[PDB]
Every structure is written in C-alpha cells, then in structure tokens.
C-alpha cells in the first residue's frame, strides 16, 4: 500500500534506477502511458508559486491522460482553516496523487501520514527531489552512465538543492562533493543519511571549502542561486577557469533561474558544457516517470 | 428553453429524484456520460475563492468531456468593469454552462436573466445547493429511501447551509429542524417557501433553540463552522447519544474541531463526512448532465 | 521558419486572407482541426489579467486538442527574475507556442528573438492584433468581401485598438479612418507603416478630428473605452444615422454604456458586438493553426 516521494532517499537505488529508466522511455514516447486516463485528477498545490514547476507538472499530468487541478498562493494557505490531515483525507477522494510545494518537511509528513494516494514534494525548504531526478536524467543521457561519476555542487550547502544532490546522488551511486564556505554547511542529519546511504551504493560524501579541489577531475559541476552576505560565495562562482580544472568532458547543471554574472558566467552557461536547457526540459519527463511509478505501486 | 440552479427549490421533488438517481449512476460509472465531449467549455468563476468547489467542479467537468475555464478573485470582480448582463451575453458564446461562486442572490438572477446557457450557484451568501445535493446523496446511500427521515442542523441558523438544508430537505421529503441561538434564525422568506414546499412532500419545518430536543430521535445530525451563544449547539458524543442509534453525522467543511464538532464525533463511526465531500463531484456532475439535456 | 504574430502587419495581405478564411471553417467546425493532439502544451501568460482573453485562448487551445498552461499576474512578472531570453528558451522546451499579454513591444520582441516556437501578442501596450482578426472575421461574415470597405474608429487614436485597426484594416484592403481629438494622435511610425501597407493593398489612411465626417458613408463604425474631450466622438444614434444605411458597429469590450457608446446603439440592429466577442475564439484558433504549420 501507498508510496510517497518527499525526499530523494524515499526511493531505494533500484527503484530510483527504474524511475530514471522510465524517464528515458517517456522522453522518447511522451503519450505512450495513460494511467490517469479518464481523466483522473491530480492535485497540484503551491504554498509559494513556482512557474517552472507548474508548467512541467501540469502538462506532464495532462500527457498521462489526467487533469491537473492547480491551486495558488492566492488561496487560503493549507493549514490555516483546517488541519492538513483533513485536507489530505478530502483530497484523497478527488484525485489520484497530490503534488505540493511547501515549506517544512513536517507539513509534508502530516499530509502523507493519512493520505490514501501518493504525496509528492514538488520543492520544499529542505529538499528539491524532483529537480535531482531531472538532473540525474540529464546526466544519464549526456554521459551514458551514473554509478561512479564525481559530482560537485558550489554555493550554499544548506539549501534545498545541496541536500537533494547529496541524497539523490549517492542513491544513484555518485561521489558527491559539496563546496561551501565557512558556515553554509549541510544540515548534519541530512549529511549522516547521505553517508549511510552511500555505504550501500559505493558512493561517498565530501564537504569542503576549497573550490579548486572540489572542481578538480569532477564529471559534473552544479550550482544554484546564492539564496532562493554574498562576499563569501564569490570564490565558488562557476566560471571558465574553474571548469577548466574539471574533467575535459565535464558538464554543467543549474536548476534555474540563473543570475548571469553572479553564481555562473555567460561563457559557462552558453558554452558547450552546459546541459541547463535539457535539464529544464527534463523536469517534465522525470516527474512524469515519478508519477507512473508511484501510481502503479499505490 | 433553459433550466438554472440558483437555489435548492429550482428543482421539483420529482426532478430532484432524477438528479439524485443519476448521481448514484455517475458514482458507479464516472466517465459513462460525455455530453461535454469536444471539449465544450464551462465557466467556473469565483468572486471569493473556494478550493473544494474548484476541485469538485473542475474535475467533474473534465470527466464529462468538457473543459473548465477557472477565474479567481485575483481578477477584476464581475460587475465592476461591465454590467453583469454584458458579461453573461459574452460567456454565452464561449461556454455551455456558467458556474459562479458569488455573494448576493440578485447577482445570480442578473446573470441568469439573459444567459443562453444554464447558470449554477457554486456557493453563495444565501444558499449552498450543490452541497446539499451531495448531502442528500450520501444520506441516501446509508439509509435508503429519503422520504420521512428527521434531519436536524445545528449552529448558525442564518447561513447558506441552513437555508439550503431547509429548502433541499423538504424537497426530498425530509423533516428539517434548524437548531439556532436567539439572534441567528433563517431568512423568513426562505423559511416560508420551505414550509410551502413541505406541504407537497409530507415534510415539516422546525426552528428552535433547544439543542437537546432537536437532537432527540434525529436520523441525521448536521453542523457547519460558526460565539458564546453557539456552544450548547456543539456536535458532541453527548449530543449524539440523544439521536437514533443508526444516526449519521454530516459537515460541509472545513471543520474547526473543538468548536462546532468534536474529534470523537467526526472520526467516530456515525461520521459520513468523507463520503460527503466525495459526493460533491458526483452530485454536481449529475446536475450538469440534467440541466444541459434540458437546455 | 518560425512565424510570430506581434503586430497586425506581421502577416502579409495574402497570409491574412488565409487565416480569416480558416477562421470561418473553424467556426463551422470547431473540433475538426487537431494539431496539438497529445495534448501538446501552449503557454498562456498574463503580465496583466484579461478574463475574455483567457476564455477564448484557453478553450481555443483545448479544441485543437492541446492543453493551455495559464499563468496569471499573480506570479512574479516574467522579466524580474530571469532574463526574458532564458524564459523563452525554457518555455520552448515545454510548449509548442507562447501566447503573451504584456506591456512594451520590446518585451515581445525579446522573447520572439530566441524562442523556437511561435510567439503571439494576445494584447500589449502598442497593439491588439488578435482582436482585429476577430473584427475582420466579423465584418467578413456580415458584408462579404473586405476590399474597399470604409471603417472608422472613434476615441483615443493612440491606443492599441487604433494602431491595430489601421495596420490590420489596411492589410485586408480597407479604407481606415481614425476620428480622434486634440493630442491623441496615432504613433507616427505606426501611422507611417499603415500608409505603406495601404499603398501595397491599394487602401488608405485618414486621421481627422471631425467625427461627423468620419461617420459619413462609413461601412463600419468602431470604438473602445476612453476623459473630457472624447465626448463629441460618442457612438450615439445620431452619429450612426450619418453612416451608410447597412453599416455595422463593433466594440472590443468592455463597454461603459453611456460614455463611448450608448444603450440604443449597442443593443440595436447594427450591433455586431456579440458576434465580435464569439469570433475571438475562432480567429485565434485559426492563427494558432496557421502559425503552427509554418513552424
């Protein structure tokens, strides 16, 4: 009974492999799977609006045969006028899955503890597991492989992207380096779980403040905006020079939106190493795959 | 020429049975009717926002083959920039029905005086007839025949729910009782029309401040979110004990647990609240079908 | 390769003829053409909300088999957070076209410059070309051939409807007149481009401050919302009578009855205002279809 996806480690490696395999299949034949045919409903809920998250979910649902019901931040926020449990119980009568952008993980857990349909974290304060799914797919297609690559993330190590890349990466078997200054380290319990999960996949977790050392011989370079007070992040800028220390075949990822000239330069964003646009496109195929997998299991 | 749904008594007892029988058919086979295949448009319009009305309507529309165009209260309110008549006449060209959540009844009548397609009260200040259709549907799946049951409503006796349970209940032949505190009674015209409808069906209308007497021998106990005068009207286990042993509890939602209802009642075995939310879809679906095929 | 629609003259006269003719076929058979079957996505984005635009576009898209993702003025404005070029490249990966209600023309040009799918001007500060297609469509069904007809616009000569009726009107072969007061002239370069386009189609452009004269003999009388020196330009029974006996009136909506146009004109027998509003749906499908097969 009933699977959810609130954080990257909610999947096991084999299960993450299956989902990513299915993402490959769906990119090629986007309307070949129709488990939401009817149309069946899926809730798409935003505590804070995210436009790229709405596009990719809303079209991806429609393409699986369903109808996304989308609700804004312009509505009464979910836990204010009734408990989240009540909202979950009611929504479970209307839709086959619940996709939710929100704040703390405790709110996701609350909803997921009583729902009779899958709950999916669209993007939270702590995690961004749908983005990492698309990151991994973009890596799979660009490099032909996943296990054993060396991935480096630069910038705020406490942000949602840094956590997810840690958890999602080691699940995929990727050696993850987080390159972050001073006091912008990963939340410790996230780091412990990523190390624990790494012991089953042959991966590892490295945290350092040395942006040169983290860039050296890396296969993938990743960065995010400096908060989604900026003096400490400048050595961590993805520029031509830093990318020149990476493997010669290395690729660059950015979940977007980018602030060109701060965390990433125009040469690197617009250059041959950048997978940024395919990555963006891949939000659509990954989340599609996620849903199918979840629905056939629930 | 054109049937609308603005209040529970726009349908006749005979016709309300048709909609209800159809709603049970639709619960069993949710995609078997496709009158909106095309897709044809339906307008879904919110002067004040309602999440659960959005879910149920929008989905039910899609499952009839059509497509709902949803506008929020994050857009210019309907009667300000142009007359309600003008908007009605334009919408009429784009959609086959108009589903509107709005305030005063006069706004609904203004829109429905000139529309060439059915107009539906999604929810308003004065009635909530789609909720009562869902209420009657779930009552019917638990206790069979509707004619003759005793239904009591507790809480603010002047809000849209009481008006509608009054209007809807007697339509279906149920004996409706509003239990309200001293300064909170139904609109007297709604009250009188309910008494006028009840004569056709064998029903009756009671208004009282006696929670204990209203709860006694009751078949169905209902409440809505409400305040010191309201507390003796609370749906609690001690109030439930006075009811019939087979009694059920409905609540239109959201609940404010610890006020109008209690955790033990709403999560207890007499609670029908979840089936009650679900049937918003089925009832509204069947309403669309019924109206479209008669327009 | 890749055709956009940001101003009316983005289409050549022959290209325009095609779209309009298609509009009539799609009016007669709304679900006959299905290029976005899948559904494929189209972006519908509003820097500024517009209810009637949402309706026509969203259902248009649904009836070609696609799915409209609609984003409101209630999200971050489209350029404040990432550059437009980046937005365009990303949307080009999700949708097959971008429909956009924005402000300055340079914002549309920016998006159009790097997107790999058609970009459409749903409404902007300078132009409203989608409305004029609907206007042209409605004039065609009333009077037959468009060539050589006289159309006069009344009110603010500098607004988006004024520009678009000039460029769109002369593109169809229509003698366009703007009746505007004082210092409410058309943009000089828009007027220039209208004059060139008119030499091509063998039509003409007139701009005057004499309403009486502009009304005289005209086939089509048009107006938009406005406030003091516009009062001699009102569409009243008087001004209508000075036109041709078989004239028609258009108004893009919403109308402030009593100001730019009176009750008796608007609810009269020369008023094509509701057909004009219906045809927003049909003309924008035709544009979608046309632009898509060329991209």
Curated annotation (Swiss-Prot), chain A:
L-ornithine binds at residues 160, 224. GO terms for cellular component: cytoplasm. It is found in: Cytoplasm. InterPro entries: Asp/Orn_carbamoyltranf_P-bd (IPR006132), Asp/Orn_carbamoylTrfase (IPR006130), Asp/Orn_carbamoylTrfase_sf (IPR036901), Asp_carbamoyltransf_Asp/Orn-bd (IPR006131), Orn/put_carbamltrans (IPR002292), OTCase_ArgI (IPR024904). GO terms for biological process: arginine biosynthetic process via ornithine; citrulline biosynthetic process; L-arginine biosynthetic process. Carbamoyl phosphate binds at residues 50-53, 77, 101, 128-131, 255-256, 283. Keywords: Amino-acid biosynthesis, Arginine biosynthesis, Cytoplasm, Transferase. Pathway: Amino-acid biosynthesis; L-arginine biosynthesis; L-arginine from L-ornithine and carbamoyl phosphate: step 1/3. Homotrimer. PANTHER family: ORNITHINE CARBAMOYLTRANSFERASE, MITOCHONDRIAL, ORNITHINE TRANSCARBAMYLASE, MITOCHONDRIAL. This is Ornithine carbamoyltransferase. It comes from Mycobacterium tuberculosis (strain ATCC 25618 / H37Rv). The lineage of its organism: Bacteria, Bacillati, Actinomycetota, Actinomycetes, Mycobacteriales.
């Amino acid at each position: 009974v009933i699977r959810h996806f609130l954080r990257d480690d909610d999947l096991s490696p084999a299960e993450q492999a299956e989902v990513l395999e299915l993402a490959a299949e769906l990119k090629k034949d986007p309307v070949s799977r129709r488990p939401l045919q009817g149309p069946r409903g899926v809730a798409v809920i935003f505590d804070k609006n995210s436009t790229r998250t709405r596009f990719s979910f809303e079209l991806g649902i429609a393409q699986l045969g369903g109808h996304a019901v989308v609700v804004d931040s312009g509505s009464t926020q979910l836990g204010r006028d009734e408990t989240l449990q009540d909202t979950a119980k009611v929504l479970s009568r209307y839709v086959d899955a619940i996709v939710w952008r929100t704040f703390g993980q405790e709110r996701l857990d609350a909803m997921a503890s009583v729902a009779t349909v899958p709950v999916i974290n669209a993007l939270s304060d702590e995690f961004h597991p749908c983005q990492v799914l698309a990151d991994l797919q973009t890596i799979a297609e660009r490099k032909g492989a996943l296990r054993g690559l060396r991935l480096s993330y630069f910038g705020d190590g406490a942000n949602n992207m840094a956590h997810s890349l840690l958890l999602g990466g080691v699940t995929a078997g990727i050696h993850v380096t987080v390159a972050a200054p001073e006091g912008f380290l990963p939340d410790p319990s996230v780091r412990a779980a990523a190390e624990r999960r790494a012991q089953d996949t042959g991966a590892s977790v490295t945290v350092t403040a040395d942006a040169h050392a983290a860039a050296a011989g890396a296969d993938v370079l990743v960065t995010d905006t400096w908060t989604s007070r900026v003096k400490p992040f400048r050595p961590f800028q993805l520029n031509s020079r830093l990318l020149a220390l990476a493997d010669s075949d290395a690729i660059v990822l950015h979940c977007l939106p980018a602030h060109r000239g701060d965390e990433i330069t125009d040469a690197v964003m617009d250059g041959p190493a950048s997978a940024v646009w395919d990555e963006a496109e891949n939000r659509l195929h990954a989340q599609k795959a996620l849903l199918v997998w979840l629905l056939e299991r629930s």
